[PDB]
Write a protein that binds this DNA or RNA. Sequence first.
DNA 1: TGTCTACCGCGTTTTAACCGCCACTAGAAGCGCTTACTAGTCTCCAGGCACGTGTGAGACCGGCACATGAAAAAAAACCGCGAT
Length: 84
Amino acid sequence: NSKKKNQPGKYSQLVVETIRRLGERNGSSLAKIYTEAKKVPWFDQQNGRTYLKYSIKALVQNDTLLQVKGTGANGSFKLNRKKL
DNA sequence: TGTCTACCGCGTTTTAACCGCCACTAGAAGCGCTTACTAGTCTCCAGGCACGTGTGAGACCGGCACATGAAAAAAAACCGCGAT
Ligand SMILES: [Ca+2]
Ligand SMILES: [Ca+2]
Ligand SMILES: [Ca+2]
Ligand SMILES: [Ca+2]
Ligand SMILES: [Ca+2]
Ligand SMILES: [Ca+2]
Ligand SMILES: [K+]
């Protein structure tokens, strides 16, 4: 209601598309998504880890994605919503 | 066997090692003189040794308490096997 949806960025979409792709039973990690997200040809190496860090911070706040536990450094996130 | 990236090789730009020199002087090192300190010698005697003896520390053993590994079995969870 009164909302006009965003269009999440090219890195913010990778978080969703990699977390759905190799969807762990519990908590897909920033380091794992980083490990294989960087095989993508358009990914820029020096900074892209920072962009997946920016993405998940917002993506968790959006009720788009949800994180289960801490582990190493609050680094385990599952895609919250599958619609009813 | 498979995946990821830390290492290697290389060309380019930067840095400071190197060399040869000169100027300055701290301090290494030699030398003569003097005495404090050590070796050496003698005499003496007590510290530390070989020897002997006892008794309590420790080794040994049996009985028990207790820690913990491994099995069997009960409870979670997870890893697929193939469906609209
Ligand atoms: Ca001197
Ligand atoms: Ca004595
Ligand atoms: Ca003795
Ligand atoms: Ca006695
Ligand atoms: Ca005694
Ligand atoms: Ca006694
Ligand atoms: K002297």
